[PDB]
């Protein structure tokens with residue numbers, strides 16, 4: 001029920017995470033807020049996710065390939081993300097990011 005969303009600052013720190021993160025990955029949203037999403041991407045997928053983020057910032061929207069997200073248990077979930085920038089109202093420095101996520105496995 002409802003798309004699985006997150007919000008981030010430009011450094012990819014979570015500012016919001018869907019509550020269902022507990023059901024899916026063990027975290028509560030409180031565990032992730034203020035933490036950079038880069039820390040939760042499997043090292044094998046980090047470069048590809050960065051390239052997607054570069055496209056996101058250039059074009060304004062991007063879709064990742066499948067990638068591995070670090071669950072609280074230490075295992076990884078295969079995920080995929082569509083994202084957009086969102087103007088902050090104060091100029092370029094105020095931009096933020098909104099994501100919708102999909103579980104691949």
Ligand SMILES: CCCCCC/C=C\CCCCCCCCCC(=O)OC[C@@H](O)CO
Nearest residue numbers: 004037052053056062069081083101102103
């Ligand atoms: C380009 C920016 C790319 C930024 C990528 C990095 C940002 C955040 C890391 C991922 C956080 C969410 C993980 C759990 C996702 C669960 C999704 C979920 O449960 O989806 C159900 C759906 O498949 C319908 O069944």
